[PDB]
């Protein structure tokens, strides 16, 4: 209900001007890449940057191979309001909430949409322990409560709940869900919308003495370990998810 300062209200527009123009620019080059009308554009292919840990920036081209990614929500950049093209993709991936993860497969259709949301998300190919520990530590299931209430999201406590909701697809237990998530199979689209999103805790998680300084240290570590390319030939920044 508070008063809104003038400086903020101009800053929001001045940042969304950059974001609307940026998203339209990436939209044009990706549309012209698919239609095979590569006559006069910047680049007609796709690079992926893999930054690891003393910070080595790799430059490797994206293969046609389907890969497994774990997209993590960030909150960035500062004054930006999300446009229509961001509302759409982040609704489809169900990542409206900050500090929230999801699994998706990466193909030649998935990769153009990844460039749009790249200032809002941090991506990367996880390992078997990252997946397995994540599911056995966090997990939600939206299903009916006692008798009347529907919107209860509780916890992956049981395996008989897994039976009742999935069952006939071949899935019986939580470890079988981990199997169809780690290895790309038939039941992946079944169980991916079953664990809807994950609820990752935020970094540092406080405003105070130690926590402000630790947030300062990490906030300056952000712009080093992540860059906003803003160009239509933006290389997709992949980071270590085992470390994250």
């Amino acid at each position: 209900n508070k008063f809104v300062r003038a400086e903020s209200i101009v800053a929001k527009t001045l940042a969304t001007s950059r974001e609307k123009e940026r998203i339209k620019r990436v939209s044009i080059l990706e549309d012209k890449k698919a239609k095979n009308e590569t006559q006069h554009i910047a680049s007609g292919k796709d690079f992926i940057l893999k930054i690891t840990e003393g910070l080595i920036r790799e430059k490797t081209t994206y293969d046609g191979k389907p890969a497994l990614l774990f997209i993590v929500r960030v909150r960035g950049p500062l004054a930006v309001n999300i446009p229509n093209k961001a509302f759409k993709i982040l609704s489809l991936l169900r990542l409206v909430e900050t500090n929230t993860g999801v699994f998706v497969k990466l193909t030649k259709n998935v990769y153009p949409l990844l460039k749009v949301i790249a200032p809002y998300v941090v991506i990367g190919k996880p390992s078997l322990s990252s997946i397995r520990s994540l599911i056995q530590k966090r997990g939600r299931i939206i299903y009916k409560g006692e008798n009347e209430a529907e919107p209860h999201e509780i916890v992956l406590n049981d395996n008989n709940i897994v039976e009742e909701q999935l069952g006939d697809h071949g899935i019986i237990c939580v470890e079988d869900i981990i199997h169809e998530i780690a290895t790309m199979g038939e039941s992946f689209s079944v169980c991916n919308f079953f664990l809807q999103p994950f609820k990752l805790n935020r970094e540092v998680s406080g405003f105070g003495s130690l926590n402000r300084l630790r947030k300062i240290k990490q906030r300056e570590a952000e712009s080093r370990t992540r860059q906003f390319s803003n160009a239509a030939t933006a290389p997709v920044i992949e980071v270590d998810i085992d470390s994250l």
Binding site: S127, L128, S129, S130, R132, S133, Q136, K137, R138, G139, I154, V155, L156, N157, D158, I172, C173, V174, E175, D176, I178, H179, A182, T183, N201, R202, S205, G206, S209, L210, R212, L213, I216, K217, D242
Partner: protein, 334 residues
């Protein structure tokens, strides 16, 4: 004797910090006069005062706007150690192993916790590291006697220097944290039990076993992050420690692995998982009503057989443990 109020006032210390010292020192209630009167001269109390000075002198730096001096205050910061606090609490090693009963119950719970704004990830990762060190040693020198799987979790019994410790491990599912519980009391218990476990594990490894601390293989921790990872280098007496020798078990996907592979490696068997993919195998452990493959080479078991073979020690017949039939009533070892 003295009242709580009179103890707090005499120490000139906050109630929280009075209770923190009370947790560390092992003091319990009316308190004993000579007990509080003995707490007064102690390095930990002085270090709590030093933390309070540091707290304001940091917010002085932060509140002004200077960041470099605040970052420098972190560098010039020492912390309280709970080293000498155990020598006066558990002077002998067999006395510390009499406490490790309650110590390993907190620590194995705190491994199976999602990190919140109450409890940082560093806290849970260090606790899980100690848990994995404990599991690795007990599976190394072969010191298990009894197992008991309950609704609550899975109980173990272990002759650690011949005094039978008991400890509980919960099931590897997400745990619903209530807002009712106080994660400031439990953090100090963790803080005391953690250091206690570091010193116990150094004593155990450097006496009879191995180098401390052992390393961990990075691409093994990427696969399991459990017990088949974390390789440990060096430089029997009980029937349970002689069981499962020259047996190779193929643990399937369906069963929990980390609660079961500990037991196989402890007794003398070998583990190949379904999970690791994502020969010599003589038994398969499967929990499905319909089993698919059915080869002539393997023997098919529901894990209850392992949970009875450890308790008896005499290798119970697998005729009452086939996949698809109802298990025997599973009695406690107590």
């Amino acid at each position: 004797f003295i009242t709580r109020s009179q103890a707090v006032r005499k120490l000139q210390v906050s109630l929280a910090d009075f209770r923190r010292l009370c947790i560390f020192k092992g003091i319990y209630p009316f308190y004993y006069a000579k007990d509080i009167q003995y707490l007064m001269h102690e390095p930990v109390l002085a270090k709590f005062r030093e933390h309070k000075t540091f707290a304001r002198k940091l917010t002085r730096a932060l509140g002004r706007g200077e960041v470099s001096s605040a970052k420098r205050l972190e560098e010039n910061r020492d912390s309280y150690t709970l080293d000498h606090i155990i020598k006066e609490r558990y002077p002998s090693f067999p006395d510390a192993i009499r406490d490790i009963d309650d110590a390993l119950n907190m620590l194995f719970l705190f491994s199976n916790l999602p990190s919140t704004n109450q409890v940082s990830s560093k806290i849970i990762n260090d606790a899980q590291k100690i848990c994995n060190q404990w599991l690795a040693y007990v599976a190394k020198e072969r010191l298990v006697r009894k197992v008991f799987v309950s609704i609550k979790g899975v109980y173990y019994q272990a002759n650690i220097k011949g005094e039978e410790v008991r400890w509980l491990v919960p099931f590897k599912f997400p745990e619903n944290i209530p807002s009712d519980v106080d994660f400031r009391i439990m953090l100090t218990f963790l803080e005391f039990y953690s250091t206690l476990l570091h010193f116990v594990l150094y004593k155990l490894y450097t006496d009879s076993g191995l180098i401390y601390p052992p390393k961990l293989d990075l691409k093994k921790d990427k696969i399991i992050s459990g017990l088949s990872s974390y390789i440990l280098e060096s430089r029997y007496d009980s029937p349970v420690a002689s069981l499962f020798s020259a047996f190779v078990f193929y643990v399937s996907r369906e069963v929990p692995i980390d609660i079961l592979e500990f037991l196989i490696l402890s007794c003398g068997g070998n583990v190949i998982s379904e999970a690791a993919m994502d020969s010599k195998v003589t038994h398969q452990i499967v929990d499905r009503p319909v089993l698919k493959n059915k080869v002539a080479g393997r023997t098919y078991i529901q894990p209850q057989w392992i949970f009875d073979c450890i308790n008896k020690g005499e290798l119970v017949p697998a005729n009452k443990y086939l996949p698809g039939e109802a298990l025997p009533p599973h009695l406690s070892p107590w």
